Paper text:
To expand the structural repertoire of determined capsid structures for the diverse Bocaparvovirus genus, viruses infecting dogs (CnMV), pigs (PBoV1), and rats (RBoV) were selected. The ORFs of these viruses coding for the major capsid protein [name] were cloned into the pFastBac1 plasmid to enable the production of the virus-like particles (VLPs), using the Bac-to-Bac expression system in insect Sf9 cells. In the icosahedral capsid, the 60 VPs assemble via two-, three-, and fivefold symmetry-related VP interactions, resulting in pores at the fivefold symmetry axes, protrusions surrounding the threefold axes, and depressions at the twofold axes.
Numbering used by the authors:
A (entry chain B), B (entry chain A): 44 to 567
C (entry chain I): 259 to 310
D (entry chain I): 517 to 567
E (entry chain J): 208 to 258
F (entry chain I), G (entry chain G): 414 to 464
Write the structure that this text describes.
């Protein structure tokens, strides 16, 4: 009833050979969002020249839970133990419980604000498990459940994309412009069946997860260098004299390999001080039936070549498609393109404060690739491949991740996709755990004039979330001891600890990395 | 439901030959602690020169129940009956019930403060039975449940130790300094599974207890003096004349004994008027890889001898390790080193007001030990042993305890420990009754700015706690009547009684002892 | 393989007073005052040792 | 071991070594141990037990 | 040698040098045979075709 | 250890040899990989704790 | 017992009372035919080893 709890606090991590189970409970707060209504959100009005986008979408009264991050499921201790004791792991399933719900009215009496509970108020809880709504979740959003278990979790508001103002507009006849505008979808969560719960009710959800592995081990040997120098190779290198070729054997310590360095792009980005085109890769969209108005009413394109339309810089900035990290097996951009978790004062350099995946010592990831030719006049020349695509006989490893990395990303729903090897370290999965949407019930109050007037309320409760992790211990024949995740290298010995104000101390002087793939060697 | 009670008031003591059962119920109050957050507590900031410590630790939002004291479980009447009718007793188990919970919001309306109950509010109750959290409980803390059953019990706030500022700091490289700082643990109770309860719920706990006995009997005969004087001993004492030894028999009333006086240290302490080094024994810690900075940034040591580091007085005071009572079988420090339960006005002497265990008449505990030698020139000389350790063939008794003594102490979790014979009278046990932690639920309220803002609430309920005591009655062949615990010797006849203001009258003129081991003789 | 971060003498809660009082010697009499909150006397004696 | 500690703990690791090439072989077949300094791999380095 | 060496602090240089494995075949169980003994081995092979 | 003399002078001295005493608790010192595993207890009538 | 002072002077003193300490092993002294067989252990809460 009203005086019975619908659950209890569940916490702690279980370790075993084949599986690890994490248990977290958070007290959460859900307010009223967006005035209980749906609104269009147009970035052209919200932005300015420093960062401009034509992004259009819908903001909703709903909010959602986000469990996607490792620091959400692992304490620094438990993350250390994962990295030290297991060669790889992946999430098998997620169980979420929402319970001990409280609905309070916010009512002002004089200057005081009084908080009384409405025992008959309800909460809307929607789970979209088949992903029929947009999936607005960017993996690096700051909306994830809090790291410390005693911190309140404010649920983020849900909003999604509709169209690009430059592409979708009223221009031309039988044009991609109108069709993008006509065909723009609208999603309202009240059109799907969902639960409504009062204080005595609770609910639960389970999600099966299929994905690739997070690999904790590193390759000490470049696959090209794994050979025995004591012996000759039968294979001979060409030597060009005049119009003929003379052959000589490769040296014992240089043996040609069948194995090609993995795909990679070393592009840092423009490095500009604005927010216009910050990513290494930007993309522009021009449907072939698109009509350019020659105004600001549409995107702008000049034809550079026959049947080629080059976007203007404003068009590139406007469509705001930013792609990164794209580096894959190239290691030069690692520090610059993977960075996160930094606030910019500009007063003090955050260069060493920022987190990035730069710390991998793996030997399958390349600085530079050189191709070698000889011209007719006898001049050898070598150039480098800065964008190197998928090619037969490539083998490589993912970059390292840390505890502040998001766990998963959603694979786009499309006909075709290539192998899912992420540069940011997420595990792409076709169906991630379904989003749990939460909304306070809309309690209307009578009004003399016609007006939308409701009762100001909010929801508080406890969310318990649990992931079962499939893991594997390592065996090695290595004689020597290996690197492990440890505090010894920290600049600041007092880290992941509390100060006298209650502040949680993380990475104040420098970013202290607790990365995967630090020490465990696998043989080629 | 909300209108049903989850228990009733349980009280009274049951006496029987082999067991005594005490039953207590208290109404308790649990507030919000520490602003619902964890904070670091550093003694260097809180203290001053009169008492300085480098003690560092964490204060928690949680609070706990403390049952450890006899006056908590025994009325003066029931304590009298234990001391008179039983030769020994020990606690077998503890049962605790928490029920009839009430959660009230504290909300200000104008100048008035209104107390309304939140029927959906919850209480967190954590039991750590395997002692995985620090066990911050000093046995003589004033935090125990109240003696009078109608007094409200305010639960104490929980806080624990992390490190010493002098030892654990950022100094040197690969030094014990950084390692102590790096390796400092942090404990958050929200990382363990625990119950959350609303007003209609209740909970219970049982703890099995294994320990040594509290002994109520005294030895009238020194084990060295138990002999029959009517007969000669065959054993002869040496008499040294020049270079030869002549032998003569021991006198009939002096017969040498095999039995050595028990271990003891007679050290009163410095007796200074400050709080710096008040105990008889102080200890200093210097890990061998410790680096002394020659500043106030670390502890300070001068090398007195080769591979010997003597701490400065400030270092001794700073690490604040105080050990007492250490006296064991030595009786001279008994009064001075066992004292407790005194408030210092300095206006009136509390010398006779203070409680201590000074009242034992037992004959196995020694004033002084003399060792006897003879030099080459024929001069006998005798010196005393002020620190006397464990030695073969020792036998002794514990000192007396009173009703204001704590029942148990926790044995440190360590590889090695010697026999558990306490100078303060507690029963050391490997696992004491697990600590019950209690916390009011954190109910957040929305705030416009980002802020941690909660609803001010508190919990009230009833705690019922029960100990089963294993006891043994005494049989004696003594002809004469024996001393018993009785009021006759009291200076103040009106004691453990109430005055017209409701004050509970205890020991105003003088400390009236109701000690164990007063009268019951055991034969050697 | 494990280490104790806490001296067994220092494991106590400073937030609260100890009932136990330290002696102060003036002339032939003893005055008592409570131990400070951060210094609480312990039952536990340092282990055996010889520094030679 | 099981711990409720929040923070990561010290572990036996090469990071503190003065000589990175240790417990390894040289070109003469010599087994390299502690030439510049004694590199300790001790017990009881990091794992806390509560009192 | 160019990558794995003793240079810098908390650098890939030292870590490659520290983390370099060493393999000794006498740390794995294996057969020892005299003149009258023999041994056999079978290996299943999965692969693509030679066309 | 702490005493006070009759004239009111507190004085403190140190215990350089400290034996087994009631209510002691301590840990062993660390070991390393070059430490011997066992030792033989002498064959005798009496022995104290093996630490 | 053997110490060395700061000025470099080694000095040795003797322990005339030596108590129970970890890792001690010893034997009882001999007896003869005129020795008593038993003694009574005092009736007390605590006693050390009976040697």
């Amino acid at each position: 009833s009203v005086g019975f709890s619908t659950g209890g606090w569940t916490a702690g991590t279980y370790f075993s050979d084949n599986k690890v189970v994490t248990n977290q409970t958070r007290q959460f707060l859900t307010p009223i969002y967006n005035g209980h209504t749906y609104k269009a959100l147009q970035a052209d009005d919200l932005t300015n020249e420093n960062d401009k986008s034509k992004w259009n979408g819908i903001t909703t009264p709903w909010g959602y839970f986000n469990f996607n991050c490792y620091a959400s499921h692992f304490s620094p201790q438990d993350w250390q133990r994962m990295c030290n004791e297991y060669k790889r792991w992946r999430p098998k399933r997620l169980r979420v419980q929402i319970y001990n719900l409280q609905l309070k009215t916010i009512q002002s009496n004089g200057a005081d604000t009084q908080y009384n509970n409405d025992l008959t108020a309800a909460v809307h809880i929607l789970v979209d498990g088949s992903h029929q709504f947009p999936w607005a979740q960017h993996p690096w959003d700051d909306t994830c459940a809090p790291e410390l278990p005693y911190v309140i979790y404010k649920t983020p508001q849900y909003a999604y994309f509709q169209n690009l103002a430059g592409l979708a507009n009223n221009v031309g006849t039988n044009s991609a412009n109108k069709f993008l505008k006509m065909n723009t979808p609208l999603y309202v969560l009240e059109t799907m069946s969902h639960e409504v719960l009062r204080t005595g009710e609770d609910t639960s959800f389970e999600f099966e997860m299929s994905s690739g592995w997070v690999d904790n081990q590193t390759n000490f040997c470049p696959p090209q260098l794994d050979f025995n120098p004591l012996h000759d190779t039968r294979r001979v290198a060409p030597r060009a004299t005049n119009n003929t070729t003379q052959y000589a054997p490769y040296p014992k310590f240089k043996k040609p390999s069948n194995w090609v360095p993995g795909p990679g792009m070393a592009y840092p980005g423009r490095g500009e001080a604005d927010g216009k085109r910050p990513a290494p890769m930007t993309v522009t969209l021009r449907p072939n039936t698109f009509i350019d108005a020659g105004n600001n009413t549409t995107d702008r394109f000049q034809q550079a070549s026959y049947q080629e339309w080059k976007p203007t810089d404003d068009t590139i900035i406007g469509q705001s498609i930013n792609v990164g990290p794209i580096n894959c097996a190239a290691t030069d951009p690692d520090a610059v393109t993977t960075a996160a978790d930094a606030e910019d004062d500009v007063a003090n350099p955050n260069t060493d404060k920022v987190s990035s995946h730069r710390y991998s010592i793996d030997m399958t990831r390349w600085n530079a690739i050189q191709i070698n030719v000889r011209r007719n006049n006898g001049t050898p020349e070598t150039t480098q491949i800065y964008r190197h695509y998928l090619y037969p006989m490539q083998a490589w490893n993912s970059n390292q991740i840390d505890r502040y990395t998001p766990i998963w990303d959603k694979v786009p729903n499309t006909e075709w996709h290539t192998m899912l090897a992420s540069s940011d370290g997420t595990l792409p999965m076709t169906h991630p755990p379904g989003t749990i949407f939460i909304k306070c019930s809309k309690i209307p109050v009578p009004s003399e004039n016609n007006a939308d007037s409701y009762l100001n309320i909010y929801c508080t409760g406890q969310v318990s979330y649990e992931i079962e992790w499939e893991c594997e211990r390592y065996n090695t024949k290595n004689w020597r001891p290996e690197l492990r995740v440890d505090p010894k290298n920290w600049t600041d010995p007092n880290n992941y600890n509390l100060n006298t104000q209650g502040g949680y101390i993380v990475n104040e002087e420098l970013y202290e990395t607790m990365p995967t793939k630090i020490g465990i060697n696998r043989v080629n």
